[PDB]
């Protein structure tokens, strides 16, 4: 396959986020939920070994998928939860690509912020896909897939 699993993955992702205005009465989570830190200062993160960087991410997509599920699990059978859900679909492609490359699953891990705002969960996803992931799709790659 491609280094475009990232691109069609990023594509598919605005499209769902966009749809969060079709949903009447969207309420900021009744419980703050952890998410894979939206930090834009990854110069030092670049120096670390080829696998490590990938291992930090696997750990960070696991926490994300874990975040989606927990906020979708403070919430009933709605429209948010319904959408906050094919998002889980998208997260899972990423998780499978990284687990496969790495030959293992890893634990939930890394620096976090908490969010009641559903929007910012739809966001750490797009943000991971744009940084940590991207700066580790550009160095040729042991493919990504």
């Amino acid at each position, epitope marked *: 396959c491609d280094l475009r699993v990232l691109s069609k993955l990023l594509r598919d992702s605005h499209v769902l986020h966009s749809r969060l205005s079709q949903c009447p009465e969207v309420h900021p989570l009744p419980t703050p939920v952890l998410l894979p830190a939206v930090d834009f200062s990854l110069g030092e993160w670049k120096t670390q070994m080829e696998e490590t960087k990938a291992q930090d991410i696997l750990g960070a997509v696991t926490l994300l998928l874990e975040g989606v599920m927990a906020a979708r699990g403070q919430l009933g059978p709605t429209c948010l939860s319904s959408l906050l859900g094919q998002l889980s679909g998208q997260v899972r492609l990423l998780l499978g690509a990284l*687990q496969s490359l790495l030959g*293992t699953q*890893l634990p939930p891990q890394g620096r976090t912020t908490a969010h009641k705002d559903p929007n910012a969960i739809f966001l750490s996803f797009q943000h991971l896909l744009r940084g940590k992931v991207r700066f580790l799709m550009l160095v040729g790659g042991s493919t990504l897939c």
Partner: antibody
Amino acid sequence: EVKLEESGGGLVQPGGSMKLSCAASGFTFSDAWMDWVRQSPEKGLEWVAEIRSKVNNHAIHYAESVKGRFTVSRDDSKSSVYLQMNSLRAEDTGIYYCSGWSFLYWGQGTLVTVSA
Amino acid sequence: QVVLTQSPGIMSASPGEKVTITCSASSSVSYMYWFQQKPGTSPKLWIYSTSNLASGVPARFRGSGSGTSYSLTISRMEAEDAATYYCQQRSGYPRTFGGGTKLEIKR
């Protein structure tokens, strides 16, 4: 929160057959890779088998000392994983454990005695 | 068929003593993983990815090494630390473990 309960162990005679079950709760089971790991005073901890998730195509791997004899499977719908054991040898004796998410979660273990 | 070997097979120590256990690998591996096990209960993840402590694991522990040689150090150990520790590698299949270091206490 996340729990795994083996059942199905106890006595089986050499050359018998026995099926282990493992019930998961409290996380999305079809998202988990699962593994079977057995223990005895002599051999120590020995990995037996791994079965991957739906997204990881359900890839299977076996310990060499077990090929032809043990089969592993899962039922996502049922949140469960299994170890179908055949032509059991005395050396298969030991506590057997399901482990979930690549050795992050561990059941309580079941004791498998192969004797006549 | 990567073979793992753990040094002092057994050892004792006192609270406030530095402890250092070694895992040697038969060929090069990118990471080591560790597990702790106390009698009559199940192994638990202790250290993964060489140097990351597991949920539940105190800051007095540190994992390190690379290639062919790794280790688990406790800076100043505590009674609750007495157990068997196993290294495990994941560079392919089979998965193999080392045969344990029993860390017991002296009194």
